[PDB]
Specification:
The structure is cut from a larger assembly and holds two copies of chain A (about 500 residues).
Chain A: E1 8-9, H1 11-30, E2 41-43, E3 49-51, H2 55-61, H3 73-80, H4 87-105, H5 111-118, H6 120-132, H7 141-147, H8 161-164, H9 166-175, E4 187-193, E5 201-203, E6 226-229, H10 240-245, H11 248-251, E7 255-258, H12 264-270, H13 283-292, E8 317-319, E9 324-326, E10 337-343, H14 346-363, H15 378-387, H16 391-394, H17 399-407, H18 411-418, H19 424-435, H20 455-458, H21 465-475, H22 477-480, E11 487-488
Parallel strand pairs in A: 4-10, 6-7
Antiparallel strand pairs in A: 1-11, 2-3, 5-10, 8-9
């Protein structure tokens, strides 16, 4: 009757295997979300040994056995590539969810009915998540720097947060054309040693990774006409390589970045005339230096010409913490802007590089939705006491659906209390009571002193595409995994 | 007396082996049919994980042990080649039927007897299944949509049932010649993203997934003379390839679709005159472009010529969902018709394409056969109560067998009760009672409210192709399988 891999589990047998798998990797992930947790150390196979707190990776490495348990990576995985933030959230409440869906299924529910609850309480939840929404519109600066600070919390520096959420709002407020499309690609993040957390600056242009070629070429130009060649100023020795260099100084460059190198004796001519030049320079390089400086990007070094060519307000080669790089400031029309990040080690620079990228992301969310929620746990307790009262509206089995799915929304505000060594059942009361009466806004779980607070007036708050995706893609993922009743296993 | 590998079973020994092999099988797949059916998770040696509801590939895969047990995919396998519908039917009430034929076999009686009831209860079944007939005409609209929607139930969308059914009945009622006959190959099924459920349409013609070869070619032709050139437009570079193109523009091709395509230089000749072309277009989008436009399909290009030639109102290359496709509407004489289909992903599409193709197979039989019946258990419970009082008719052994074959028909209707988690006892007396009385179209078992139900007056009803073959194929399978009673075994 079957063959090829076959040991077979319906009903109880089934329950066990899909609950244990999903419970598992929740426990995994429970104590990594927000201010109150904690670090994990992986090791595979290659005996290789790897500290991390962040949920995707964490289930990536760990070669899994449970196939059912494999379909749950899948649901943290599609929350990182998309939005980013909330890996954690989508998933954890995807295992909790399921525990609670066990108590029932042991009431012999018709798995039928329990889904007929958590669907109509997904849906309603949409109508809830949308109103607690405390609308503040798109380019208001106050709030931009409260969505940006929350882009920077639980992090190796949330400290900076006020200087990492400023030159960020200036750098996305400066990129986006026709209010309501929201571009990342544009904001590069360079990371150099020396400073503090607050000496991060926003050069209206492009800061690349580039020496001066020829030691010839003046180490700084004033009002410079930067060229872009993506393609060859290599030909083989004497003549060819002279005709390429005397045609750059024919058109109008002082400044040249070529994605395709330089020889010796051709930088000697470049520096003969007062032309500086930057070798090997990356095509990442190229496009940024194009919108910085103002450039239309060419093919070769042989089309290089002042007209497809830029305008730039200072251009020095600056050695910065024992490495040379090329700056390109005062930029006329930056689409797209680089933010210099001063910094600790490469590790706190990188992070203030990621505490902008996911800041520009998340504000490219308050362009397209200029909603703002709910200071982490906040909107949960609100959804709580609404959707409880929603339940007294359904009737039948779907009663017992929607009640359970509210009371498991208290999962996340709970653990972030517990992790915090707090009395849960006091605060819960504190926050719930203060949310029905203040609003969206006001109604928080602050870690610190331990009591309900204005994540708003702090503000401490996060974008709205974050909360939205994290809950939907999670919620419907764990009702798939709900619903397979029959496991015939095998490799 | 018997080789190698040996071991031998009758009666006790046997009956248990067979039955086991029977029942397991069934147990498996019972809980999968109807409103109420649950997925399954296969896995082979290879490692490959696999999620499927449908009986055939269920038993396909799962590499089975017992050679009697092998005789049991044969019986879901035939049911899928012919109609499709019902795989689950034939089979499950194949192995139930075997459970109850156990009670009597341990009764001692004469298999000979048991069979002797089951064949008269087949044949009188026939007489009952052509009365519960609620008979309409075949090219009516009402009952065309009912057939249509009952081809589109327990599925991915069931949803768009009513939109799914509209454009399928106008696609069938435009195919058929000489109201008797109900061809399938004339209805293509094109799948793109963008839309909702209800907005899928019926292009009186053919839509192919090919974009314009040559980027001179005019991107839109008004009153166009489509060519069909299966041939080679392939010659060696220069000359031979030109007078191949210059022979298209001689004829009166505007518009040209080649089964083998177009080199280089040829494109840029095509595109120089005004002639659009589509390269490596299958034999499939050949055929249906033929019927689409009106063409007679030809050998080569060099034949592609005015009269073998078509009439289409509209031919634009329109990027849809991302992707660029060639439309071919305004179709004078479609014998055969595309039906453009918008939802979701890949997946909601390809389902609406499969919820049409079964919808063109089961309207190809109320052409067939003229004739309607009531899903999920009008016909079963009605057989029940009639075949029951046909027992007290018969006298003998046969008694015993006709009773057990009726009470077996309570099977299906009842599981779909249990699976909704309702009470089967109170329903089955309500729908029996309702069906004696009101009629063959009207005594149902709606899972949703729970209660007996005018199939007919909702619009949930199924073809005839359908219940006819699924009860035949299955009945006389699983009494044949009764009747081997010795098992000598080898590897």
């Amino acid at each position: 009757v079957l063959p090829e891999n076959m040991k077979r589990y319906m009903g109880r047998d089934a329950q066990r295997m899909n609950i244990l798998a999903g419970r598992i990797i929740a426990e995994t992930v429970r104590s990594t979300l927000g201010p109150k947790g904690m670090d994990k150390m992986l090791v595979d196979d290659l005996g290789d040994v790897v500290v991390t707190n962040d949920g995707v990776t964490i289930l990536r490495e760990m070669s899994v056995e449970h196939p059912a348990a494999k379909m749950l990576i899948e649901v943290a995985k599609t929350q990182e590539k998309e939005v980013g933030d909330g890996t954690t959230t989508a998933v954890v409440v995807a295992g909790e969810l399921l525990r609670k869906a066990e108590e029932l299924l042991d009431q012999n529910v018709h798995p039928t009915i329990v889904v007929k609850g958590y669907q109509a309480a997904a849906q309603k939840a949409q109508e809830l998540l949308k109103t607690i929404a405390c609308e503040v519109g798109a380019q208001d600066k106050e709030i931009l720097t409260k969505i940006a600070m929350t882009s920077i919390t639980g992090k190796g520096a949330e400290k900076a947060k006020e200087k990492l959420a400023e030159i960020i709002v200036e750098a996305v407020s400066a990129v986006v054309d026709d209010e309501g499309k929201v571009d990342k690609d544009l904001i590069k993040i360079e990371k150099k040693s020396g400073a503090s957390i607050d000496d991060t600056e926003l050069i209206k242009g492009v800061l690349v990774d580039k020496e001066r070629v020829s030691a010839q070429m003046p180490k700084k130009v004033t009002d410079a006409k930067i060229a872009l060649l993506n393609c060859a100023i290599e030909e083989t020795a004497s003549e060819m390589l002279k005709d390429m260099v005397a045609e750059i100084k024919a058109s109008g460059a002082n400044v040249l970045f070529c994605q395709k190198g330089i020889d010796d004796l051709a930088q000697h001519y470049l520096a003969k005339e007062g032309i500086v030049a930057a070798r090997r320079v990356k095509k990442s390089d190229m496009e940024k230096l194009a919108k910085a400086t103002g450039a239309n990007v060419i093919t070769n070094i042989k089309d290089l010409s002042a007209q497809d060519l830029g305008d730039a307000g200072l251009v020095e080669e600056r050695k910065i913490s024992g490495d040379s790089m090329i700056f390109v400031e005062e930029c006329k029309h930056p689409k797209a802007v680089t933010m210099l990040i001063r910094g600790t080690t490469e590790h706190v620079i990188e992070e203030v590089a990621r505490a902008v990228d996911d800041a520009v992301g998340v504000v490219g969310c308050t362009i397209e939705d200029g909603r703002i929620v709910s200071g982490g746990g906040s909107t949960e307790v609100e959804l709580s006491m609404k959707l409880r009262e929603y339940a007294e509206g359904i009737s039948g089995r779907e009663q017992l659906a929607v009640r359970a799915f509210a009371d498991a929304l208290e999962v996340i505000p709970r653990t972030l209390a517990e992790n915090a060594g707090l009395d849960a059942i006091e605060i819960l009361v504190k926050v719930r009571a203060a949310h029905a009466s203040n609003g969206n806004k006001c109604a928080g779980l602050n870690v610190f002193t331990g009591a309900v607070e204005d994540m708003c007036e702090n503000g401490v708050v996060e974008p709205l595409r974050v909360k939205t995706q994290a809950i939907q893609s999670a919620a419907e993922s764990t009702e798939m995994l709900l619903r397979i009743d029959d496991v015939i296993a095998a490799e």
